[PDB]
Amino acid sequence: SGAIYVGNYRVVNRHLATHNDWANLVWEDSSRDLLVSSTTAQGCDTIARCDCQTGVYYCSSRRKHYPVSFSKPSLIFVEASEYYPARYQSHLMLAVGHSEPGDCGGILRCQHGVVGIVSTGGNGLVGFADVRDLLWLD
Ligand SMILES: CCCSc1cccc(OC)c1NC(=O)N1CCC[C@H](C(N)=O)C1
Ligand SMILES: [Zn+2]
């Protein structure tokens, strides 16, 4: 679990959005596993506007932050799960690092701010949904 709170927006993994997120929907994209909902209070986060490929992410299954080198946002095949059919997920960045089901929503940050959130993983990999191209969040 986890979310980004910026301005009057809450960014979450689309597959973990709540009834409240859908009732206050701003934008969603199943191909990116992202959903943004509106909030009444001002958020705590700021968004990176950069091309960093190194950063640090929070891994809830280890209660720890890990440094990572991650690929540029791209279209990557993601196998079927209880949440989605087998498909290509766009704007996804992969890295070698631990992750397991439950780690989605953990934030990835570089020196400039929030880069994205954990969205996929497996066998020593962790995938992050990029949010740096969503300029309207600011
Ligand atoms: C219960 C799923 C076990 S596979 C796994 C194994 C290790 C880490 C994992 O995520 C952090 C995952 N989970 C996973 O990749 N997805 C399941 C939820 C929806 C994700 C998506 N964006 O399509 C894909
Ligand atoms: Zn950066």
XYZ file of C-alpha atoms and ligand atoms in Angstrom, residues 13 15 33 78-79 81-84 87 89 99-104 118-123 125-126, ligand 1:
49
model
C -2.033 2.203 -7.816
C -5.667 -1.800 -8.653
C -1.857 1.057 -13.188
C 2.968 -7.949 -17.277
C 1.519 -11.452 -16.734
C -3.020 -11.363 -12.087
C -6.254 -11.276 -10.059
C -6.371 -7.529 -10.975
C -5.578 -7.442 -14.695
C -1.136 -7.045 -21.035
C 1.850 -1.814 -18.998
C 9.507 -6.663 -3.814
C 6.560 -8.895 -3.090
C 2.744 -8.622 -3.218
C 1.913 -5.941 -0.682
C 4.810 -3.634 -1.745
C 2.774 -1.718 -4.400
C 5.960 0.435 -6.893
C 3.550 -1.257 -9.339
C 5.032 -4.690 -10.293
C 7.816 -7.111 -9.233
C 9.062 -10.628 -9.111
C 12.150 -12.791 -8.612
C 12.872 -7.322 -9.617
C 10.775 -4.275 -8.758
C -0.291 -11.125 -6.259
C 0.607 -10.842 -7.452
C 1.932 -11.565 -7.364
S 3.213 -11.232 -8.597
C 4.292 -10.101 -7.754
C 5.502 -10.551 -7.237
C 6.359 -9.654 -6.615
C 6.021 -8.310 -6.495
C 4.812 -7.848 -7.003
O 4.369 -6.549 -6.959
C 5.072 -5.624 -6.123
C 3.944 -8.748 -7.631
N 2.690 -8.303 -8.136
C 2.592 -7.861 -9.410
O 3.565 -7.697 -10.128
N 1.334 -7.546 -9.835
C 0.097 -7.854 -9.103
C -0.726 -6.599 -8.860
C -0.917 -5.816 -10.169
C 0.438 -5.501 -10.826
C 0.266 -4.763 -12.142
N 0.745 -3.528 -12.181
O -0.281 -5.300 -13.111
C 1.135 -6.839 -11.100
